[PDB]
Amino acid sequence: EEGKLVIWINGDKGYNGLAEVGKKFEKDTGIKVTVEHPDKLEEKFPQVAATGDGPDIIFWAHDRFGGYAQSGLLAEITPDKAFQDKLYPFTWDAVRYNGKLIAYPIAVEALSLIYNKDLLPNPPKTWEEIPALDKELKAKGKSALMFNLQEPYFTWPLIAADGGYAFKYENGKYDIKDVGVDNAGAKAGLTFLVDLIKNKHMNADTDYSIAEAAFNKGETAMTINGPWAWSNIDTSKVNYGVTVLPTFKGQPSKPFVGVLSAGINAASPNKELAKEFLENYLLTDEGLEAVNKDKPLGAVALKSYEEELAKDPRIAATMENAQKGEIMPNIPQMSAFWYAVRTAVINAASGRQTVDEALKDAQTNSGSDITSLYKKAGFLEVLFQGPLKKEEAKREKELKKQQRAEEKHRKELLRQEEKKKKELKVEEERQRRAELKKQKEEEKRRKEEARLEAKRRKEEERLKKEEEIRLKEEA
């Protein structure tokens, strides 16, 4: 339908703020803007867009946007050099598929180093200081660092710090035949990761839940997580800080960068209108603020608005780690990379393979046939369909108990503050009467004290003249 903008954005984002920016776009141009949040739009959009229908604009991470363009679902955006300068240069690389821009960057997301301020006022700036910092904290019944070691997304920051990379990115493209997994840099990064486990500084069987709980309970001093986990730490009432990830051999850690992007439908009749909306209404200070006020975006690609968000050290550390991080490729071959590195880490942490053997097979399995891997996943999904469907229900059973625990926390924080605001309001009215009665009393006691001195002088002048005439009259 030409002449009307339809926007699809996930339900966990600030869509109400996005609708307000749409109403502002409608108040100026008269074009209706309807912001919807359908369920599972990452899988529903690729089907509706292929048949012509669908939204004019769709919001989602840039990783899925790669296959969208290969399918022909996203139109090539055309921002001028002026607007390209409004966003950080590295964010455009995440929305560039096949050398052409196919999405507008909105928000930037990357892993950071979260530390307990009560245990560590000064967090370590280097990975080499953690072994000695853990030996110190082990004497006091705690540990230094505990983060997810199962998925390679959490272990890549250390593995790629010395010179690792998924696929080499050049001229705006990706070389599936050039995987940077078994080089001298990745070998040192993974060796130091394994040496941390062999020296009993980390346990190889630590996943996401084990790490999130150990930090919330105050048992470990540090953890590695993204802005999505800040809510869970706020409920634990742990004085935590979000800082830059440690360096390894002088080089900073390289976490994968995820960019929330807004793409224009390739079959949309309102491509020019979507361009006016995204560049001149959404990607502005007033626009992004309306969305961030409804649901925080974290670090955003807009420079002018990142300055104000960067006053929050947590968002400032996320953008710093993102700029030092690695743009996550949107190439479908990435699936082979995820599976290859996953087994490379697990086999190296369990002693199945050495660091050299694990990375050697990983660089080979990264170039594995993707369709063969998909069929391999289909065979295992059916083979373990029972325990898997029970695991998914258990995670949904714990997510409802973990979102009710947050609702109970903000209910507690809203109750104590609303009661403290009325409690101080009573004291302000208490001393207001206590000082009003003190003013009425002290002002009328000093006033009468002046009448005491004036009347006493009148008495002194009257008794002295009455005595004067009483002595003058001699009998």
Residue numbers in the entry: 3 to 477
Please give sentences taken from the publication describing this entry.
The histone chaperone chromatin assembly factor 1 (CAF-1) deposits two nascent histone H3/H4 dimers onto newly replicated DNA forming the central core of the nucleosome known as the tetrasome. However, the lysine/glutamic acid/arginine-rich (KER) region of the Cac1 subunit has been implicated as a possible second DNA-binding domain (DBD), as CAF-1 lacking the WHD could still bind to DNA.
To gain insight into how the KER region binds to DNA and facilitates CAF-1 function in vivo, we determined the structure of the yKER at 2.81 Å resolution. Crystals grown of a maltose-binding protein (MBP)–KER fusion construct contained four copies of the MBP-yKER per asymmetric unit. The yKER extended from the MBP as an almost entirely solvent exposed continuous alpha-helix. Superposition of the four KER copies gives root mean square deviation (RMSD) values between 0.66 and 2.2 Å, as the helices have a marked curvature in the region of aa 165–190 and larger deviations at the termini. In the structure, we saw no evidence of interactions between yKER helices or formation of any tertiary structure, consistent with the definition of an SAH domain. The circular dichroism (CD) spectrum of the KER showed characteristics of only alpha helical secondary structure, including the positive absorption band at 195 nm and two negative bands at 208 and 222 nm, validating in solution the structure of the KER observed in the crystal. We noticed that the yKER SAH is particularly enriched in positively charged residues, unlike the Myosin 7a SAH.
